[model samples]
Target: APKDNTWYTGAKLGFSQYHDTGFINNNGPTHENQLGAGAFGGYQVNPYVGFEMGYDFLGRMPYKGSVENGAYKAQGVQLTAKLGYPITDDLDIYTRLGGMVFRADTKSNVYGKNHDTGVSPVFAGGVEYAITPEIATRLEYQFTNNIGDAHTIGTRPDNGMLSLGVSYRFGQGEAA
Candidate 1:
């Protein structure tokens, strides 16, 4: 398959490490499952450059019980410019650079629901395989500048994730 200017849409499922899980509670949670996810799409402007945007959920971090019993959930919208090197007709290595505008919400049994909103730089790198001219799959590592903890209750730590994603390209081979 040849790489060219095309439009693609995809969804991702991943895992995240709340770097400060230890900062949450001394003994508890079972940590409840820190999963990350997103839906993304982009225009391949050319084989070397592209543009993409997506909304991702950083998963919920639960502090089972302690001085504080609650969970922190976060979400962000990111737009990135991408650069890629086609290693083969069917494989590509790429990087996405951008910023994520995020909001971290804390829901506590002892406290109410409140949030912190701001922007953080997001860096992602991946290896992609073109399963077909119209579809592709990739394994990606996404890193973000850890945002601060909650204003009053629990803690929302660093978000480091690895994801598997698949995308479908429309009107493939139509690029001039």
Candidate 2:
């Protein structure tokens, strides 16, 4: 358990994919999975509560079709509140509630280029294991609201990702 008021910084790498309810048709958004990466710094207000902010690069998703062939790349800024529970001296489980500003660029052979930006709600859960007081590793699953309708093809596109990250605590925020 980290001491109260401890600060931490970390970087994460993961895989991301999207789900669109309107994607039932073959003409819907692409199902390509891509690499996602992020960096964050935060403060533990106490043993069980914290806050973090970060930037995520969600990689590119490409669609291949006879009528429409193109790809979209996504990136975002996120602000989140973390609530955690210590299951043991070395393990912690947590949930996150937050919002993100997502920006995406869509390029289509037929429609040229399009850009969209919007705010989305975020929900996540993760587990962290401390290898040492100052070093830890985590695995997380997250979901976000739609990035908005990119073009005339379908409805908005919702997204999700699974991540693995490492964190370093500084300035006396060591786990007990």
Candidate 3:
């Protein structure tokens, strides 16, 4: 269907909390808490669609069992294309697919050192309810694969992830 074009540019701020799972045989750290807060903005093609570019910093911290007990930080940029379907003027369902350009830094005691830059595909979708013309709350999910252990990263079939956030859309053709 041809979408009605409109200005959908705005900003979103959110908090994500998820688990980082590692490989089976590698046995570095089974799971750790990864958390982040970020903001993004872009243009909407219509009430049903939009495109955006944003950044999220997913912090990898101590896993509790580690001797060195430091932190691993992952910072990346995302380009997302989203489709939104309105259930009501105040509520919409949105889904997005994107890519992440990530850089990883790890402070470890037993592993010695860690640092890498990579790219991964990101997938996300959610429902947002507009509280006002510019404010909205979102429930969403995102995932990133491979920041450490080449064989364990992609080969092991486990990755890092995030869930939940709130956003504010401002300027031009937002919910009103």
Candidate 4:
């Protein structure tokens, strides 16, 4: 007979790249890029579904022509409530609906000076490939919409993410 119901959890680390665009109604525009690293751990309730959360380290260098208030950089936290399902014993699919709060510090020579922080909703979907009973690799796409009001920049589209990472399972349990 197949094994009965089982539950498991793990930690993850990965690299993330943000494909950023500008929503400037004023000033000459430019494109931007960011490099990010994050950690996550989740519980697998029977090879199909689970819950997880983590913190992301995101950093960026302003596009040479991009607008800024000071040296451009951002720091933030991410919280996710995710669902994981196995397409097969070795392949799993997942989605996360949650929030991200990014605190941005702008530069002094470009445009505005009062824009500093933002909080947004994070929605994402991806797939995971198990390499061992306790370890797996994943690739996912994430989206965030900055909803708060800012100074010169009325708003921005800090949208779209493509990430690749490895996850480590905690506690002893084989992949179902």
- Which candidate leads the pack in TM-score? 2
Residue lDDT tens for model 2, 94-168: 777788887756665444443346688876788877888778887888776744334643554455668888888
Encode model 4's per-residue lDDT on 16-109: one tens digit a residue: 3322333444333232324455666555556555566665544443244644434443566666677777889888887877787766566554
RMSD of each: 7.5, 7.1, 7.1, 7.5
Judged by lDDT against the true structure, how good is candidate 1? 0.67
Models sorted by TM-score, best on top = 2, 1, 3, 4
In candidate 1, stretches whose alpha carbon ends up further than 4 angstroms from where it belongs are 1-4, 20-33, 58-74, 109-116, 143-159, 172-176
Predicted structure 1, TM vs. truth: 0.68
Winner on TM-score (1 vs 2): 2
Overall local distance difference test of candidate 2: 0.67
Each model's total of backbone clashes: 0, 0, 0, 5
Cα lDDT tens digits for candidate 1, 37-152: 77898878767688778876654532324432334436778888888778989899988888888776666544444334668877788887789877888778866565433343
**Candidate 3 per-residue lDDT over residues 88-119, each given as its tens digit:** 88878878887878775665554644334668
- How many clashing pairs does model 3 include? 0
Q: What would the TM-scores of all predictions be?
A: 0.68, 0.68, 0.62, 0.61
For each candidate in the order shown, give its overall lDDT on alpha carbons.
Answer: 0.67, 0.67, 0.57, 0.57
Q: Which residue runs of candidate 3 sit more than 4 Å off their true CA positions? A: 1-33, 58-70, 110-115, 143-160, 172-176
Kindly report which residue stretches of model 4 are placed more than 4 angstroms away from their true locations once superposed. 1-33, 59-74, 107-115, 143-159, 173-176
Question: Which residues of candidate 2, in runs, are more than 4 Å off?
Answer: 1-3, 21-33, 59-74, 110-115, 143-160, 172-176
Q: Model 4: how far is 3 from its true place, Å?
A: 12
Error of 4 at 59 (Å): 5.7
